[PDB]
Design a protein around this ligand. Structure first.
Ligand SMILES: OC[C@H]1O[C@H](O[C@H]2[C@H](O)[C@@H](O)[C@@H](O[C@H]3[C@H](O)[C@@H](O)[C@@H](O[C@H]4[C@H](O)[C@@H](O)[C@@H](O[C@H]5[C@H](O)[C@@H](O)[C@@H](O[C@H]6[C@H](O)[C@@H](O)[C@@H](O)O[C@@H]6CO)O[C@@H]5CO)O[C@@H]4CO)O[C@@H]3CO)O[C@@H]2CO)[C@H](O)[C@@H](O)[C@@H]1O
Ligand SMILES: OC[C@H]1O[C@H](O[C@H]2[C@H](O)[C@@H](O)[C@@H](O[C@H]3[C@H](O)[C@@H](O)[C@@H](O[C@H]4[C@H](O)[C@@H](O)[C@@H](O[C@H]5[C@H](O)[C@@H](O)[C@@H](O)O[C@@H]5CO)O[C@@H]4CO)O[C@@H]3CO)O[C@@H]2CO)[C@H](O)[C@@H](O)[C@@H]1O
Length: 476
């Protein structure tokens, strides 16, 4: 009697490339590529487990541009420059970026504390500021290789900074290939999402938000987004085919977001399985175990993730010692194993790149110990998405209707419903009536709405500039 454990690590970045200047206005794709996007599937070279990955097509597009050397990244240009050539604005952005990340354990360099307590920075201090920002984002693979430079902690030279930069781009150049390799070798399945990570249920039917928040105000959706929702899925299939050589049969719905109409669209586009959140299961069916494979109207398979286990990794274990955390996780899995007489399927699904920066040493002690311990428990079998879809010795159930929602409180309020987020939908609705190209699809990404209408925070004005630029470019 095994416990079937399925990790599904979701990787995504919205499009940071401004269409009039061609510049990447934030560096987050670069930094998560060098820190997480190669390294997370690279664990499979050292550990004999299965791990699965979602790659959004807009993320793939950007990884390709960085690998090809065509991304003009304005933040990275300020890192690369000799400090004598830095503009004041570039120094301010570098300071602000450091202050944003200052308390994360991956920024735990004593020299960073020294630099942020200086009234004025000279050339050698700016070089350290540049290089330590780079090295803070070092991934597991190069943390071994650059150990000498990482332990120095200070007094970096321009030659050393450039050496780090070169190694980082080598990692990026190898990134799509490792996903293809682990897929071909049967070490994991790779899924994708509708192209720019939109909220498919709202595009199909904005009235679905009322199934969970009846009091919400939404704008007048005077134009149909139903064909765009189809296009997000179809273009994603095409990009996935280019990279991996088949049409994707698994997709991760952005924000775990589903609805009856969205599940029908996924089915019509040939998707055979997806996962969503336990809250939607609880919202939709009174008696429902999350350890079964569900069939929605016998059209498409659905798994509901184990929210507790996913949130332990996403929110709890960064504050723990690595062995405390792994013992706790294994203990919980054992309690599941002993709590039922069938073989449960346990889906652990969360973002694959956003939690590690809060862990000691980028979560490498935690993941190395977790994966080492998992692979040695005879009662746990980690599965690919393909194996979880096809496994016969699993329990199964039919469901006929779900209540539309997301993994954020089961509802859509993080993307719609207040004055500021509604104004973005209004801009998009008016833009859609006049849209001439696929930049309207870029503007439909969920990320723009997530950041809008929150309390002010550094750099979020850039998301607004991007969104509004895509909206304008869509009409030309
Ligand atoms: O603000 C202070 C904050 O600091 C830390 O949080 C940071 C976190 O450690 C880091 O991983 C990242 O979080 C990312 C995350 O990695 C992504 O996967 C993504 O999270 C989504 C998540 O996977 C989904 O399950 C869903 O999360 C829901 C939960 O299911 C709800 O239970 C609720 O979670 C709260 C949880 O119950 C509490 O124990 C507490 O830890 O706080 C949790 C969040 O408030 O709400 C969330 C939805 O917010 O949806 C997620 C969003 O798509 O995205 C995350 C970032 O949004 O960044 C965190 C900094 O924001 C520390 O862990 C926290 O305890 C602390 O409160
Ligand atoms: O009120 C302020 C706010 O403060 C804190 O947030 C700040 C972060 O700590 C800080 O790092 C920075 O956040 C950056 C982030 O680091 C950067 O990577 C980028 O985020 C990307 C994700 O990396 C990417 O995966 C994708 O995330 C999706 C994800 O795929 C999806 O599944 C789901 O989880 O939604 C995510 C959002 O759509 O896209 C985002 C970009 O959209 O950009 C971030 C912003 O620059 O800045 C934060 C704000 O200052 C606390 O986290 C927070 O709770 C407080 O609300």
């Amino acid at each position: 009697k095994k416990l079937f454990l399925v990790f599904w690590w979701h990787m995504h970045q919205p499009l940071y490339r401004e269409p009039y200047t061609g510049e990447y206005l934030l560096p987050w794709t670069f930094f998560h590529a060098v820190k997480d996007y190669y390294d997370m599937p690279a664990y499979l070279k050292d550990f004999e487990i299965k791990l699965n990955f979602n790659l959004t097509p807009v993320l793939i597009d950007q990884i390709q541009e960085y690998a090809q050397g065509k991304a003009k990244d304005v933040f990275l240009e300020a890192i690369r420059k000799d400090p004598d050539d830095l503009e004041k604005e570039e120094v301010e952005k570098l300071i602000e970026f450091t202050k944003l990340n200052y308390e994360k354990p991956i920024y735990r360099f004593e020299r960073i504390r020294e630099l942020m307590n200086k009234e004025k920075l000279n050339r050698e201090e700016l070089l350290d500021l540049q290089t330590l920002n780079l090295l803070a984002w070092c991934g597991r693979t190069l943390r071994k290789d650059l150990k000498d430079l990482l332990n120095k902690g200070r007094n970096y030279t321009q030659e050393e900074k450039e050496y780090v930069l070169n190694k980082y781009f080598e990692i990026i150049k190898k990134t799509l290939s490792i996903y293809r390799e682990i897929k071909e070798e049967g070490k994991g399945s790779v899924s994708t999402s509708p192209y720019y990570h939109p909220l498919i249920p709202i595009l199909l039917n904005p009235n679905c938000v009322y199934e969970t928040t009846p009091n919400v105000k939404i704008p007048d959706f005077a134009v149909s987004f139903r064909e765009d929702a189809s296009k997000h899925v179809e273009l994603a299939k095409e990009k996935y085919f280019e990279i991996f050589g088949e049409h994707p049969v698994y997709m991760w719905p952005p924000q775990a977001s589903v609805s009856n109409e969205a599940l029908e669209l996924y089915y019509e586009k040939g998707i055979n399985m997806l996962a969503t959140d336990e809250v939607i299961l609880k919202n939709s069916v009174e008696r429902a175990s999350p350890y079964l494979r569900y069939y929605f109207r016998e059209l498409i398979s659905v798994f509901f993730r184990d929210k507790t286990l996913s949130d332990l990794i996403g929110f709890s274990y960064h504050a723990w010692n690595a062995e405390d955390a792994v013992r706790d996780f294994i203990g919980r899995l054992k309690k599941i194993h002993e709590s039922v007489d069938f073989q449960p399927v346990v889906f652990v699904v969360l973002d694959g790149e956003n939690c590690w920066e809060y862990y000691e040493e980028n979560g490498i002690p935690f993941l190395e110990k977790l994966y080492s311990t998992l692979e040695k428990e005879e009662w746990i079998e980690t599965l690919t998405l393909e194996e979880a879809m096809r496994k016969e010795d699993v329990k199964t159930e039919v469901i006929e209707s779900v209540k539309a929602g997301t993994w954020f409180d089961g509802n859509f309020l993080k993307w719609i419903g207040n004055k500021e987020k509604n104004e973005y939908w209004k801009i998009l609705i008016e833009a859609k009536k006049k849209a001439k190209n696929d930049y309207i699809l870029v503007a439909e990404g969920s990320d723009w709405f997530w950041w809008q209408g929150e309390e002010k925070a550094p750099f979020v004005e850039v998301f607004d500039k991007l969104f509004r630029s895509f909206v304008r470019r869509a009409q030309e």
